[PDB]
Amino acid sequence: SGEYPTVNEIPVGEVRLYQIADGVWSHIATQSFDGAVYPSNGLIVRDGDELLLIDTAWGAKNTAALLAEIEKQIGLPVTRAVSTHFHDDRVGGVDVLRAAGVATYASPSTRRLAEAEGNEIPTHSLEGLSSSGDAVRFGPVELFYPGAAHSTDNLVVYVPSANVLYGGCAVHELSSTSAGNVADADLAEWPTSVERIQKHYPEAEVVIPGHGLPGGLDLLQHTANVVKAHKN
Numbered sequence: 036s037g038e039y040p041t042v043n044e045i046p047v048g049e050v051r052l053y054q055i056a057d058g059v060w061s062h063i064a065t066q067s068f069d070g071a072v073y074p075s076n077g078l079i080v081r082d083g084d085e086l087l088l089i090d091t092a093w094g095a096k097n098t099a100a101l102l103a104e105i106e107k108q109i110g111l112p113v114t115r116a117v118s119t120h121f122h123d124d125r126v127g128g129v130d131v132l133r134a135a136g137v138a139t140y141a142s143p144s145t146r147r148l149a150e151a152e153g154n155e156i157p158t159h160s161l162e163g164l165s166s167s168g169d170a171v172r173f174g175p176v177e178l179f180y181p182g183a184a185h186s187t188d189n190l191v192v193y194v195p196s197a198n199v200l201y202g203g204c205a206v207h208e209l210s211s212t213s214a215g216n217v218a219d220a221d222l223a224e225w226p227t228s229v230e231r232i233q234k235h236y237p238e239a240e241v242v243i244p245g246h247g248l249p250g251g252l253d254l255l256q257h258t259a260n261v262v263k264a265h266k267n
């Protein structure tokens with residue numbers, strides 16, 4: 036009924052959309068992993084009469100449900116997708132997208148990591164993102180590589196028309212107490228990577244984490260704090 040949708044509110048297999056700003060939505064789905072259920076976010080950005088998708092909905096069936104929810108709620112075709120790192124919450128569903136006519140993209144680093152680990156592999160490589168601080172335009176967004184954080188390949192996404200910063204899994208929600216799933220993280224570099232985000236996007240108005248509730252710029256400092264404490 037209008038609040039941001041939470042883990043116990045979304046059965047695994049269903050997807051909900053949340054309007055963030057004019058022409059910007061997040062998508063929210065839930066998935067089981069190692070015997071626990073988690074929510075996860077992605078982004079949808081209007082690109083004229085098409086849509087740009089950021090991240091899958093964490094699995095094939097969830098991503099099919101995402102496409103159906105977009106058709107119901109928005110009714111414009113998803114033509115391109117970018118995955119912001121190599122984990123299944125970002126690429127699981129890429130095969131569904133590709134067979135639905137979506138062109139799928141990720142950095143070469145993400146593509147290599149996905150391939151090596153047995154995750155689904157986006158089709159197209161995004162060059163120009165291999166050094167921290169790099170940025171490239173992609174339709175209505177800017178893609179930014181902040182450096183290693185949650186993963187070595189993690190990208191963030193900025194929507195300049197709306198000052199929306201999609202941090203993906205490099206950014207945690209305000210309620211977080213731990214740094215989430217740190218299996219592939221660089222805890223030592225993560226605060227430096229967040230500092231690069233803070234410096235590059237000082238006018239961000241909405242910050243969206245990879246999992247959990249959007250907020251403002253405080254998500255970035257909170258993330259740095261939780262990561263430093265986890266490491267400590």
Ligand SMILES: C[C@@H](c1cccc2c(-c3ccc(NS(=O)(=O)C4COC4)c(F)c3)c(C(=O)O)[nH]c12)N1C[C@]2(C[C@@H](CN)C2)OC1=O
Pocket residue numbers: 068073122123124185204210211212213214215216217218219245246247
């Ligand atoms: C698919 C993804 C994954 C799986 C399960 C959970 C998560 C979380 C996560 C976990 C917990 C909380 N929120 S919480 O519970 O409230 C917490 C904060 O305070 C207390 C959360 F928000 C997110 C993240 C994330 O952190 O992005 N990713 C996850 N994989 C799997 C893999 C690959 C490796 C294979 N060896 C392991 O690594 C990953 O990331």
Ligand SMILES: [Zn+2]
Pocket residue numbers: 120122124185186204
């Ligand atoms: Zn991850």
Ligand SMILES: [Zn+2]
Pocket residue numbers: 122124204245246
């Ligand atoms: Zn994640």
